[PDB]
Structure formats: C-alpha cells, structure tokens
Design a protein around this ligand. Structure first.
Ligand SMILES: CCCCCCCCCCCCCCCCCC(=O)OC[C@H](COP(=O)([O-])OCC(O)COP(=O)([O-])OC[C@@H](COC(=O)CCCCCCCCCCCCCCCCC)OC(=O)CCCCCCCCCCCCCCCCC)OC(=O)CCCCCCCCCCCCCCCCC
Ligand SMILES: CCCCCCCCCCCCCCCCCC(=O)OC[C@H](COP(=O)([O-])OCC[N+](C)(C)C)OC(=O)CCCCCCCCCCCCCCCCC
Lengths: 74, 28
C-alpha cells in the first residue's frame, strides 16, 4: 500500500537531527578530559604569575618558601 | 467439498485517511 511505503520511506527523513544527537553524545563523553589537562596547565603556569596572584588564587595558603636566606636587613 | 470463500471487493480510499490506520514505526 502507498501508505505503508510512505511511512517506510519517511522513517529516515531526519538524518541530520540524529547526527546532531550523535555529536551531543560523543562530546558529553569526551569533554570531562578537560579537567586533568586543565589542572596540569595551571600547575605549570602558576610559578610564572605574580607573587600576589599566587597568594590570591590559593586564598592565601601559598607563601614564599622559607629556606633561610635573603632575610630583612636592620 | 471446497470452502465457501467470502468475497473481498476492491475499494479506493484517500491515502491521508488510510495513513491514520498505519502502525507506528521508528528507526531513529
Ligand atoms: C603519609 C603516609 C604515607 C602514605 C604512603 C602511600 C603511598 C603514596 C605516597 C604518599 C606519601 C607521600 C609521598 C610524597 C610525594 C610528594 C613529593 C613529590 O612527589 O615530590 C616530587 C619532587 C618535586 O619537587 P618540587 O617540584 O621541587 O616541589 C615544589 C612544590 O611543588 C612547590 O611548588 P609550588 O608551590 O610552586 O606549586 C604551585 C601550587 C601551590 O600549591 C598550593 O599552595 C596549594 C595549597 C594546598 C593546600 C592543601 C589543601 C588540603 C588540606 C586541607 C585540610 C582539610 C581539613 C579537613 C580535614 C581535617 C579536619 C576534619 O599551585 C598549583 O599547583 C596551582 C594551583 C591550582 C591549579 C588549579 C586552578 C584552580 C583555580 C582556583 C579557582 C578559585 C578562585 C581563585 C581566585 C582568587 C580570587 C577569589 O621531585 C623532585 O624534586 C624531582 C625529582 C627528579 C626526578 C625527575 C623525573 C624524571 C625526569 C627524567 C625524564 C627524562 C628521560 C626521558 C623520559 C622518561 C620517561 C619514562
Ligand atoms: C598545548 C600546550 C603546549 C605547551 C608547550 C610549551 C612548552 C614551553 C613552555 C615555555 C614557557 C615559557 C614562559 C615564558 C615566560 C618566562 C618563563 C620564566 O622562566 O619566567 C621566570 C619565572 C620565575 O620568575 P623570576 O623569579 O625569574 O622573575 C620574574 C618574575 N615573574 C615571573 C613574576 C615575572 O620562571 C618560571 O616560573 C618558569 C616558567 C614556568 C612556566 C611554564 C609554562 C608552560 C606552558 C605550558 C602550558 C600549556 C597549556 C595548554 C595551552 C594550549 C592552548 C591551546
């Protein structure tokens, strides 16, 4: 019957939408890898920033290492 | 004795109404 053949033909009309859905799925699986690599980027580039920005970005936890040299002069 | 077959006559119909009797089918 024409009706059934029409339904079967039309079953795949929306190919592009299904492909967009596929884009969404694979990117959802992939994108969390940005966190490891982001941490490492920041790890490497932290000692390049100004001392003030190092102190700020760590909420004051980070401070200049104390190795027993270059102390104040009376 | 052969069975007494019932007749089924041909009739022509509007496809857009026959399409309301088609089962639902999905591939995507
Ligand atoms: C204990 C029991 C034993 C258990 C045993 C179990 C087994 C496991 C072991 C565990 C035991 C301990 C072991 C020790 C391990 C650690 C030591 C270690 O590893 O040292 C290594 C050591 C490294 O030393 P180092 O690098 O000098 O260390 C310097 C420091 O890193 C200092 O460097 P730094 O200070 O410059 O670091 C910078 C750091 C600084 O870090 C900090 O200061 C962080 C502070 C941390 C605080 C801690 C918090 C947690 C604690 C909280 C407590 C909670 C309380 C609750 C619980 C208690 C109460 C209930 O900051 C960052 O990293 C970046 C910041 C974060 C980035 C992410 C971005 C976030 C943005 C924030 C957004 C929010 C807004 C901010 C904006 C502000 C405005 C709002 O090794 C060496 O020295 C090198 C060795 C030589 C080997 C070379 C390697 C091989 C190379 C050859 C290759 C060539 C051949 C070819 C290739 C071969 C391939 C095969
Ligand atoms: C895809 C990423 C590929 C990454 C390849 C990069 C490898 C080579 C990195 C070279 C970095 C050089 C930085 C230039 C500034 C001078 C550095 C220096 O020694 O300064 C003095 C400073 C110390 O300063 P100082 O004490 O000499 O006095 C100057 C004081 N400051 C710094 C405040 C001005 O030395 C360091 O701290 C060493 C530099 C560490 C920085 C390392 C950066 C690594 C970059 C990789 C990040 C990649 C993220 C992904 C990006 C991809 C995006 C698409």
């Amino acid at each position: 019957s024409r009706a059934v053949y029409a339904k079967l033909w039309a079953s795949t009309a929306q190919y592009t939408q299904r492909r967009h859905y596929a884009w969404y799925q694979i990117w959802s699986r992939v994108i969390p890898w940005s966190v490891p690599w982001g941490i490492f980027a920041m790890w490497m580039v932290f000692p390049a920033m100004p001392v003030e920005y190092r102190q700020a970005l760590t909420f004051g936890i980070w401070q200049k290492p104390n190795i027993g040299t270059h102390g104040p002069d009376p | 004795p052969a069975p007494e077959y019932r007749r089924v006559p041909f009739v022509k119909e509007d496809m857009e109404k026959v399409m309301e009797e088609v089962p639902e089918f999905k591939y995507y």
